[PDB]
Design a protein around this ligand. Structure first.
Ligand SMILES: [Mg+2]
Ligand SMILES: [Zn+2]
Ligand SMILES: [Zn+2]
Ligand SMILES: [Zn+2]
Ligand SMILES: [Zn+2]
Lengths: 45, 169, 66, 57, 1161, 51, 51
RNA sequence: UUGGUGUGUUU
């Protein structure tokens, strides 16, 4: 469900806790999560 | 002295076993227990013990006796001391020496200088300091969090109920 | 990195005067004289632009992260 | 290093988390302010409180 | 031409530091390793031989089945990550660092297995040698900075260091004693042995220790009547007389030993000390009886008869003594004439025709970098490979199988060895853990950029710490331009740790054989035509430790060879070095000599260049074109004859002036400038060398400092050992890198007191601090002793506000073939021992989504293992630290080396520089932020300028750091005239020019402006000195060292509270605290401390046998001293649990402490 | 880059991002006729401190 | 939404340094005594930006 | 909530 951002081709792909974790375009195996649905806050000082 | 130090007691027939608080098992990675080296050494002693009692119950070529007995003496020697001159040390399963009882007592970080004469304790605190001349001579500044962490037991008496109830509040 | 907004010492807003400062530098000015033209007369708003060294170009040298 | 190197004091509570001193006590502890650490043991009884307050003050 | 000015030397430095960059010393010698060393370590001992020859219960089948493997060529490539999938692809250092990898290449090797039939198994991956960054044999030497941003490598990175199990490790240049030099030390007095002539042998190829022949003069000062000497040999057990080992090496009569040794039949004093040595060695008269004699002490075996006893003695005198000279025979003249030089020398020093030699005369040492270290450890595990193949061969020849060799290399051997031995650096086979030079390789530090720039250069010294001796810790005066007279840490390291200077280069290791050809190329005469009575005045010539011949005139030869290094017939880093005093002349080619460059002064009265510098301005214009007028870099300078290299041995034989205005003898009494000496001793000098620049004597963390030449030198050392703790910009790719420490300083300014040297550490393009406003004036007692004042509004504007990064880690373990781990969100039911934080911030997949505010004490990585055979899972979460806050950045998720999952998380927050945070001058005037004032409450000068940092007047006058004032003044001027003033030291920049310019731009001459109270404006009676200055931020804060503790974690072993900050331990109320408690005497406080806030523990004693054997059941409330049948004489005590531990330990050693509770007498 | 800010009303006491103004000169008695200030001086007080 | 080369509180800091017009400001009240729980259009100037 | 080694830094 999570947009696991690809490390190479920027593809937003979710994985079902079962997929071997790579780029679908070049085999690049590095993903990262993307930012939340929440809104971040800061006090700007 | 007879009732205290009778010099047939300086030869050990029966070498005691301490309880396992003195060699308690350590969680290697939270499922397996690496043992303390006293447990490894008392196991080695009991193995050489049984390999002693194996020889006098069968055919014994007379220096097989001598070597297993001298090995028993060796294991009892390294139980109390792994620093004996002239001979190589008793060695572990990493390439390290064994923690004896003598190594638990001598040295800067033994039990006395490292744990009894001086030790670590609690209700301490520690920081970095700063000057502040707007003060008396017998006053020291306290950061608030350190005041929160440490405490002091004041007795509930008949002259301090109200404030202490407030300090609950 | 990239230009701050105010001065550190006084508090005159300077951040706008970065691009103008580079454009004045392009013609062959000298840096003190360029600060002279921008009306920077206390040295507070002279060290807040004179010292400043630029890294965020190097961060945009990373051909796209995503 | 000498018998003043532990001395009793009184408590003043301040924000901004560092230890405050007088600067006349800088000489006996031999502390400067390039980052020294000074400890703070606490009594846990009445008895030791009076011990400190009458001798090690 | 004209005057070579200062900036012409900065042209020279731009050419040098555009050729090499910085870290030549790693890269070029590691290239030497990968190009030649493994090829020759393999082809050292290329063949093994088995044989199972005859009487195999045979039919007399006498068959030399000789099993012969010959090792061949190595195969080299890029690193390769074979997946758990099995696919192989090009690994890259980003993909390395993200994935805990080992940037390691295939090292292949073919095997020539042959069989003797004299009757009477392909490219195996043999190991993974890890590849350094930025090497020739890394894939990032080449390839296009554009694509390097496409490949995540910063151009202002430089590499030099290795990658192991992910993280970055480095090689300290370890510092060994020099080999094969003929030393003399004198021995301490409570002993019968006074003078010593010592050596340490090591083979020419290979650079490996074999022998250590020692000489001990028997005789204290008028003690030890027979003043004769014995030798000590390798593989003996006892000292052996000198003339006997001479007759053992094959020179028997007295006349030829005195002909070999003695050079003066008139030196009757030394000849007089000679005579008893022969008169003592009379009883062993010819060769083989001395061979038999040394057979009796030195491991020739008992009952092994004369011919094989003497065989063995001929082996310790064939191999195993003087091995580095040669290991073939026939040159007993070479061996004995070496030893005759030794006897010559030790008798020179025992009559004190000389000083003793000294330990630290820095030409008499060498250095070991990655090249020689990989040579040694590769040699070791390569021998281990040898015997592994040998072991498998003697099993698959008994059963006689055609072995394919590919199941005969379990290549976890050398990969596992090198991986551990750079992992912790406990240098050796792990089963040689102790007795090993510990701490070779180190965590590389990435706290700021210059810190790494020094730390990649650092050398360390193995005296150990046994011996408090201040002779090896002296700044001994060979150090001119080779190490750093400023930088060395505070404390235990001091005097040892030597940072290679900003003109250091590491000499590689070179074929000595053509140098030999250069020697015999001019009629050097051989050693066998040598008679010192025929030639007493010939010059005896060394090549790295072998005397090879004699010659009459060294001067024409050193002209020719020195000009051939000025041309390039030699390696231009080989130190051809002349002496004239000894009638000797050495050529080192050795590995690890610390050399340095100098401007070649035309030292020769042949033309008008004499006295002048040979460097012309035409060369300067050539360097400013980038090419020669039909590539021209620093290499062509080296091979032009303008700059020659010297190491510490040629530093003996030179003559330097410091700056090129001192070469011509100059033209007064001005009270601004500095006073060079006259040098009027030699009316007609022959200067041979002049310094390029004096601020090139510094280390890397030393050239940063503005004007080091106006301070008290402990503050120079302090500033150099604080410059490494700056907060700044460490490498420009902190977006993609995941490291456990990283900190970005926000607003980094190049200092207005820049140097000219900070161009070459890039610090003006990556700085690590700011210019804030200095105002040295006691204001309200808050800067009394080194604290300071900081204006809070300036922080609110962003002053030094600090980014904070941290990378965590976790991975999956495998507890069975069908039993693995799983990072999931654990329940409150199925899982054991939930952490006492919450779990809410976790996601469906166990790793928290970014953007989410995080506190301490709550999870990020919940590693749940089901317990191998409800309530069957283990909660083994990896939490965020108990001190931190933050908002999360870039949550990596991938697959490990193992094939399972892998995680790394890079949390971040930002720390406000607040009260207590340490700061630092650039002259050590350090301290903490004492107090914060808002904006109006500052003092403020006539225009409105307020300050931000107020160091103390009383911080100055004893610390004597007048350079700090000079920096503040030069800062204010270069701010107002608007440019960065050259504060590189040792110029004619006085104070007078700065004074006149500040006045003539409309100000006071000596800095002051009339500043005010902020609370009245009633003018401050004295005028206040006031300006900008460059500041930095040291790595400590107060939020990392505050700690207090009520109770909590106690150890199982001793029940005394635990040690360390990380587990919230307790403090050590140590010995001398108890001492001062005794001095005050209030011991009731001491009974609080060592009973009640610690391991308070309660035991029992039977009152008859006095022991603690009494078994304690309490809810049944019964007791039994079972050695006594005592059931009534029972007391309890209150003792420390460690005291009880003492008692149980002692009774387990059979001593009986018995505690009777009454005085007896 | 999609950002949403609020703007609220603070003074310089909370923080100096609410600084109204920049830099304030201030002087009185430029010829020291009260001798409230005292010059430090090498040689002579009148020459070296510019007007 | 942010995806920049700059971190977040960084940009909030730099936005805090930005000069606004406040000529009319005394008929705008202080934040900590304005009659709303968290922000409304009585006491805010909501900037939403997405370049 | 591990041990045990080892390295660097603070006074
Ligand atoms: Mg100090
Ligand atoms: Zn992709
Ligand atoms: Zn300004
Ligand atoms: Zn009893
Ligand atoms: Zn409202």
């Amino acid at each position: 469900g999570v947009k696991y951002t690809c490390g190479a081709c920027a593809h937003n792909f979710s994985l079902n806790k079962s997929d071997p974790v790579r780029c679908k375009e070049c085999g690049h195996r590095v993903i990262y999560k993307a930012r939340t649905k929440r809104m971040i806050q800061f006090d700007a000082r | 002295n007879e009732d205290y130090a009778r010099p047939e007691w300086m030869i050990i027939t029966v070498l005691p076993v301490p309880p396992p608080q003195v060699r308690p098992s350590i969680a290697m990675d939270e499922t397996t227990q690496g043992q303390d080296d006293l447990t490894h050494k008392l196991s080695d002693i009991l193995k050489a013990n049984i390999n002693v009692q194996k020889l006098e119950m069968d055919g014994s070529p007379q220096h097989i006796i001598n070597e297993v007995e001298q090995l028993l003496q060796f294991h009892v020697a390294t139980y109390m001391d792994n620093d004996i001159a002239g001979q190589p040390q008793a060695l572990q399963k990493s390439g390290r020496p064994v923690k004896a009882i003598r190594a638990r007592l001598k040295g800067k970080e033994g039990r006395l200088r490292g744990n009894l004469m001086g030790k670590r304790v609690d209700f301490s605190a520690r920081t970095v300091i700063s000057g502040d001349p707007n003060l008396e001579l017998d006053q020291v500044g306290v950061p608030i969090s350190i005041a929160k962490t440490l405490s002091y037991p004041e007795t509930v008496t008949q002259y301090n109920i109200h404030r202490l109830t407030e300090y609950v509040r | 990195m990239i230009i701050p907004v105010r001065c550190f010492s006084c508090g005159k807003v300077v951040g706008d005067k970065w691009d103008a400062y580079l454009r004045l530098l392009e013609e062959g000015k000298q840096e003190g004289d360029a600060l002279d033209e921008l009306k920077l007369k206390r040295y507070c708003c002279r060290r807040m632009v004179l010292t400043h060294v630029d890294l965020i170009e190097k961060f945009l040298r990373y051909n796209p992260l995503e | 290093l000498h018998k003043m190197s532990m001395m009793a004091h009184r408590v003043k509570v301040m924000p901004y988390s560092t230890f405050r001193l007088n600067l006349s006590v800088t000489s006996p502890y031999n502390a400067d302010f390039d980052g020294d650490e000074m400890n703070l043991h606490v009594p846990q009884s009445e008895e030791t409180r009076a011990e400190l307050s009458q001798l090690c003050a | 031409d004209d005057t070579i000015t200062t900036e012409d030397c900065w042209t020279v430095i731009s050419a040098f530091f555009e050729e090499k960059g910085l870290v030549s010393q790693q890269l070029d010698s590691f290239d030497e390793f990968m190009e030649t060393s493994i090829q020759d370590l393999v082809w050292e001992e290329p063949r093994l031989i088995l044989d199972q020859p005859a009487q195999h219960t045979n039919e007399k089948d006498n068959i030399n089945k000789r099993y012969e493997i010959r090792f061949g060529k190595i195969y080299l490539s890029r690193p390769t990550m074979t997946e758990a999938d099995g696919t192989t692809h090009a690994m890259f250092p980003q993909e390395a660092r993200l994935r805990n990898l080992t940037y390691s290449s295939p090292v292949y090797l073919d095997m020539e297995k042959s069989m003797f039939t004299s009757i009477d198994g392909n490219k195996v991956h043999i190991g993974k040698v890890p590849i350094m960054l930025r090497s020739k044999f890394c894939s990032l030497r080449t390839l296009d900075e554009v694509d390097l941003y496409k490949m995540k490598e910063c151009p202002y990175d430089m590499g030099g260091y290795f990658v192991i199990n992910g993280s970055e490790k480095v090689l300290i240049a370890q510092e060994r004693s020099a080999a094969n030099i003929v030393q003399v030390f004198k021995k301490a007095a409570p002993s019968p042995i006074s003078h010593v002539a010592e050596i340490r042998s090591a083979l020419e190829k290979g650079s490996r220790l074999i022998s250590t022949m020692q000489i001990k003069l028997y005789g204290r000062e008028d003690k030890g009547t027979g003043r004769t000497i014995k030798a000590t040999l390798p593989y003996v057990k006892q000292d052996i007389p000198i003339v006997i080992v001479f007759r053992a090496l094959g020179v028997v009569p007295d006349g030829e030993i005195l002909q070999h040794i003695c050079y003066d039949e008139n030196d009757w004093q030394m000849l007089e000390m000679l005579k008893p040595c022969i008169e003592e060695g009379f009883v062993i008269q010819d060769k083989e009886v001395a061979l038999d004699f040394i057979g009796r002490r030195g491991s020739a075996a008992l009952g092994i008869r004369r011919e094989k006893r003497i065989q063995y003695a001929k082996d310790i005198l064939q191999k195993e003594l003087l091995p580095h000279i040669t290991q073939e025979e026939g040159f007993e003249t070479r061996k004995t004439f070496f030893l005759g030089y030794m006897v010559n020398r030790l008798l020179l020093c025992a009559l004190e025709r000389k000083d003793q030699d000294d330990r630290d005369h820095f030409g008499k040492k060498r250095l070991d970098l990655a090249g020689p270290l990989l040579a040694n450890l590769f040699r070791i595990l390569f021998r281990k490979l040898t015997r592994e193949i040998y072991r498998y061969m003697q099993r698959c020849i008994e059963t006689d199988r055609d072995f394919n060799l590919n199941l005969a290399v379990k290549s976890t051997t050398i990969t596992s060895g090198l991986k551990y031995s750079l992992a912790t650096g406990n240098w050796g086979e792990q089963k040689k853990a102790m007795s090993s030079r510990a701490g070779v390789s180190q965590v590389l530090n990435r706290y700021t950029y210059s810190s790494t720039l020094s730390h990649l250069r650092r050398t360390n010294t193995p005296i150990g710490r046994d011996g408090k001796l201040a002779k090896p810790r002296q700044l001994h005066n060979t150090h001119w331009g080779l190490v750093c007279p400023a930088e060395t840490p505070e404390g235990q390291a001091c005097g040892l740790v030597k940072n290679l200077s900003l003109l250091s280069g590491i000499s590689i290791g070179s074929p000595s054989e053509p140098i030999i050809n250069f020697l015999e190329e001019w009629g050097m005469e051989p050693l066998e035509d040598y008679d010192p009575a025929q030639h007493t005045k010939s010059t005896r010539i060394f090549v790295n430790g072998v005397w090879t011949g004699i010659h009459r005139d060294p001067s024409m030869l050193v002209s020719t060879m020195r000009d051939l290094r000025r041309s390039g017939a030699i390696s231009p880093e080989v130190s051809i070095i002349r002496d004239i005093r000894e009638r000797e002349f050495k050529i080192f080619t050795d590995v690890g000599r610390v050399y340095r460059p100098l401007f070649i002064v035309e030292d020769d009265e042949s033309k008008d260049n004499k006295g002048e510098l040979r460097i012309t301005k035409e060369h300067i214009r050539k360097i400013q074109q980038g090419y020669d007028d039909d590539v021209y870099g620093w290499s062509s300078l080296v091979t032009s004859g303008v700059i020659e290299y010297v190491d510490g041995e040629e530093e003996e034989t030179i003559m330097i002036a410091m700056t090129p205005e001192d070469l011509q003898t100059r033209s007064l009494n001005d009270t601004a400038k500095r006073i060079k000496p006259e040098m009027s001793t030699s009316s007609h000098h022959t200067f041979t060398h002049c310094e390029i620049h004096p601020s090139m004597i510094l280390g890397v963390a030393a050239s940063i400092i503005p004007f080091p030449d106006h301070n008290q030198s402990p503050r120079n050392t302090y500033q150099s050992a604080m410059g490494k703790q700056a907060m700044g910009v460490f490498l420009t790719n902190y977006n993609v890198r995941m490291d456990t420490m990283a900190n970005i300083l926000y607003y980094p300014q190049k200092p207005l007191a820049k140097t000219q040297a900070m161009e070459y550490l890039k610090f003006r393009e990556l700085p690590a601090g700011q210019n804030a406003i200095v105002a040295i004036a006691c204001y309200s007692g808050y800067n009394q002793e080194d604290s300071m004042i900081m204006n809070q509004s300036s922080i609110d504007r962003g002053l030094f506000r600090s980014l904070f990064f941290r990378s965590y880690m976790d991975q999956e373990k495998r507890f069975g073939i069908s039993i693995v781990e799983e990072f999931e969100k654990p329940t409150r039911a199925t899982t054991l021992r939930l952490k006492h934080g919450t779990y809410e911030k976790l996601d469906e997949d166990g790793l928290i989504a970014p953007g989410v505010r995080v506190s301490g004490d709550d999870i990020i990585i919940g590693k749940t293992t089901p317990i191998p055979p409800y309530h069957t899972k283990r909660d083994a979460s990896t939490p965020l630290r108990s001190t931190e806050n933050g908002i999360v950045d870039q949550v990596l998720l991938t697959t490990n080396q193992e094939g399972l999952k892998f995680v790394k998380v890079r949390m971040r927050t930002t720390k406000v520089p607040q009260i207590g945070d340490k700061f630092a001058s650039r002259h050590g005037q350090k301290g903490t932020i004492g107090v914060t004032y808002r904006h109006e409450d500052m003092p403020f000068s006539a225009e409105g300028i307020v300050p931000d940092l107020i160091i103390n007047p009383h911080a100055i006058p004893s610390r004597m750091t007048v350079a700090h004032l000079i920096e503040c003044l030069l800062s204010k001027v270069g701010s107002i005239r608007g440019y960065e003033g050259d504060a590189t030291p040792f110029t004619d920049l006085t104070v007078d020019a700065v004074s006149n310019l500040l006045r003539d731009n409309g100000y006071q001459s000596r800095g002051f402006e009339v500043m005010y109270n902020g609370h009245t404006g009633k003018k401050l009676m004295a005028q206040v000195f006031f300006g900008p200055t460059y500041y930095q931020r040291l790595r400590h804060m107060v939020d990392d060292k505050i700690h207090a503790r009520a109770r909590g974690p106690v150890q199982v072993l001793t029940r005394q509270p635990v040690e360390g900050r990380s587990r919230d331990g307790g403090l050590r109320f140590g010995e001398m605290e108890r001492d001062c408690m005794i001095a005050h005497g209030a011991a009731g406080f001491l009974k609080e401390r060592l009973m009640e806030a610690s391991d308070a523990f309660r035991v029992h004693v039977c009152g008859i046998c006095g022991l603690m054997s009494v078994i304690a059941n309490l809810k049944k409330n019964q007791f039994e001293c079972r050695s006594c049948k005592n059931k009534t004489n029972i007391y309890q005590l209150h003792i420390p649990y460690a005291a009880k531990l003492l008692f149980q330990e002692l009774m387990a050693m059979n001593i009986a402490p018995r505690l009777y509770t009454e005085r007896s007498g | 880059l999609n950002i949403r800010c609020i703007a609220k009303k603070g003074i310089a006491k909370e923080h100096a991002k609410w600084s109204p103004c920049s830099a304030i000169a201030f002087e009185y008695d430029p010829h020291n006729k009260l001798k409230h200030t005292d010059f430090w001086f090498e040689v002579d007080a009148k020459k070296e401190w510019p007007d | 939404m942010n995806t920049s080369v700059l971190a977040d509180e960084f940009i909030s800091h730099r936005l805090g340094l930005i000069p606004l017009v406040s000529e009319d400001v005394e008929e705008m009240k202080y934040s900590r005594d304005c009659t709303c729980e968290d922000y409304c259009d009585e006491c805010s100037v909501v900037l939403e930006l997405s370049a």
